[PDB]
Amino acid sequence: ERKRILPTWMLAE
């Protein structure tokens, strides 16, 4: 599956 890189704000805890 093609990997995407999410913007930092979406990865915030």
Place this chain on the structure above:
Amino acid sequence: KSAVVLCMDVGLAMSHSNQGKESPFEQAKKVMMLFLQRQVFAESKDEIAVVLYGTDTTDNALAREDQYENISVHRHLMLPDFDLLEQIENVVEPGSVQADFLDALIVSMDLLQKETLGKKYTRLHIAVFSDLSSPFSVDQLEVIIANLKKAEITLQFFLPFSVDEGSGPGKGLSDQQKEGIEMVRKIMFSLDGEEGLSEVFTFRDALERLSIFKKIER
């Protein structure tokens, strides 16, 4: 005031004209123009952005080598104004490629996240117009859904064909389109259960449904 992104598939398959008198691209553009005209003439305070996916060029904040390709932010989150109607019916042309609709959704979410900072809205909304012809990756979809919930963004999907119980005989949908329909249903149910599945409509219902939604305190 609402914040709304119109997230429009302009990929090559949308140009194929074989039902009625208008291609899916032409049908969707007509709905968008009628909606924007209504908003302008009524002096609505809603802010409306436009994101296109399937465009030959790329123009968005997330774009890098092999990321968020062929997705273009045509209009930022602003009041629609008379001048934009001209701008929409000139720079919305059919694309020659296809793009990943979940990439387009992320671009639309990122646009809302940045451009709604420090301001109060009744709802944050993304309306997708597509024939679901294009492949997509589900990488980190669970984080996309988590962020839609956290930011309280609602989703609506508009397709050029029915998919409900009265859809009737088969419409020759490709396996990719059937996969797209299923993933749309998974997303909408993840967001709002059975009620979310009800937010999947046809182009024929889009102009009127764009305005209707259930109020939820924020």
